[PDB]
Amino acid sequence: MPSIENFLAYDFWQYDVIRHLFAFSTAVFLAGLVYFAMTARTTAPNYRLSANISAVVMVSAALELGQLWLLWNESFQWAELQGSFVPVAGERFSNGYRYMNWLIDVPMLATQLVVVCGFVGTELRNRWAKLTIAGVLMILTGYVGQYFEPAVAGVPGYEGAEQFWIWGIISTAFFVWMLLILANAVRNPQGAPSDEVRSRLKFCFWFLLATWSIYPFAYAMPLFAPTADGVVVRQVIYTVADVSSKLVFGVILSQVALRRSAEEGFEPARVA
C-alpha cells in the first residue's frame, strides 16, 4: 500500500517543507490542548464534554502527524551525488496511516457538535452511534480506495485504478449520511438558544462540511499525477484540512459552547 509520495525524489526544500508541516501541526495540536483545558473550566457542565472531546482530538492529531513526521524521516535517505532525498527500499510512507486516527477524530468532531446542539442521554447516544457507524464505514471504505492511488497516478506496474472510484464514491455516500445527521442536529438545537446561538451552530455545521470536504480533495490529488512539487501542494492541503477541521473548528465550537453557557446563566462563561 505505497502512496504516490513513495515513488518520488525530493530536493532539500521540498523534503524540509513537508517535514516542517508535520512538526508544526504536531506542535499546534499540543498547544491547542492548553486552550481546551482552560476553556473547559469556564464552560457550563452540560457543554464541558465538547471541550474535553477537543482535547482527545488534539492528542489523536498530535500522534497522527507525529507518526507522519517519523515515517517521512525514516522512508527517505539523502543521496549526496543526487542532492535529493530518495525513497528507501522496504520503508514505505503512506498518507493512508492518517486514516487509523480518523476513527477517533471523525466520530468525536461530529459528536461534539451534537453536544453543543444540546442533545443529552439517549438522543445524544443515538446520534453518536449513527455518526460512529457512518464515520467508521466512511474511513474504512476510503482506506480501501486510497490503497490503489498509485494506479490512479499512472505509477508504472500498478493496477486497480477502478477501486479508487468504486470505494471513493462509497465513502462519499457515508460522508453525506454524516452531514445529514449533523444538518438535522444544528436545525433542531435543544433548550431555548438565542437566534445568535442558532446562527452560530449552523456556521459550525458548514465550517465542518467545508473543512471535511478538503479530505476527499487530498484523496483525489493522485488524479493530477503529481511531481515532488504536487506532493508538497498535497501535504499543504492536508495541513490546512487538519488544523482547520480539528483545532480551528474546536476553538469556534468552544466559543459557541461558552455563549450557550453564558445564556443559561453560567457566570464563569459570562465573565469570559
Ligand X SMILES: CCCCCCCCCCCCCCCCCCCC
Ligand Y SMILES: CCCCCCCC/C=C\CCCCCCCC(=O)O
Residues of the shown chain interacting with ligand X in the complex, contacts defined by CB under 6 A:
28, 31-35, 37-38, 41, 59, 62-63, 66-67, 70-71, 74, 129, 132-133, 136-137, 140-141, 144, 169, 172-173, 176, 203, 207, 210-211, 236, 239-240, 243-244, 247-248, 251-252, 255
Least distance to ligand X from the beta carbon of 125, Å? 9
Residue 77 DSSP SS3: strand
Of 27, 79, 120, 176, which lies in the binding site for ligand Y, with binding defined by CB under 6 A? 176
User: Considering beta carbons, is residue 10 or 22 the nearer one to ligand X?
Assistant: 22
**Three cell numbers written together for 136:** 467508521
Cβ-Cβ contacts under 8 Å for 90 (sequence gap 6 or more): none
According to DSSP H, which parts of 76-160 are helical?
A: 98-117, 121-146, 149-152
190 binds ligand Y (CB under 6 A): no
**Three cell numbers written together for 161:** 485504478
Of 159, 192, 265, 271, which lies in the binding site for ligand Y, with binding defined by CB under 6 A? 159
User: Considering beta carbons, is residue 4 or 208 the nearer one to ligand X?
Assistant: 208
Measured in degrees and rounded to the nearest 5, phi and psi for residue 118 equal: 100, 15
132 binds ligand Y (CB under 6 A): no
**Three cell numbers written together for 264:** 443559561
Of 2, 160, 226, 230, which lies in the binding site for ligand Y, with binding defined by CB under 6 A? 160
Distance of alpha carbon 54 from alpha carbon 56, whole angstroms: 5
Distance of alpha carbon 237 from alpha carbon 218, whole angstroms: 7
Of these partners, ligand Y, ligand X, none, which one is at the site of residue 240 (CB under 5 to 8 Å by kind)? ligand X
Per DSSP, 84 falls in state E
Least distance to ligand Y from the beta carbon of 111, Å? 17
**Three cell numbers written together for 91:** 520503508
Distance of alpha carbon 70 from alpha carbon 87, whole angstroms: 14
With contacts defined by CB under 6 A, name the span among 75-83, 125-133, 183-191, 230-238 that binds ligand Y.
183-191
Distance of alpha carbon 221 from alpha carbon 233, whole angstroms: 9
Residue 9 DSSP SS3: coil
163 binds ligand Y (CB under 6 A): yes
Which residues of this chain interact with ligand Y, rule CB under 6 A?
144, 159-160, 163, 172, 175-176, 179-180, 183, 186-187, 202, 205, 213, 216
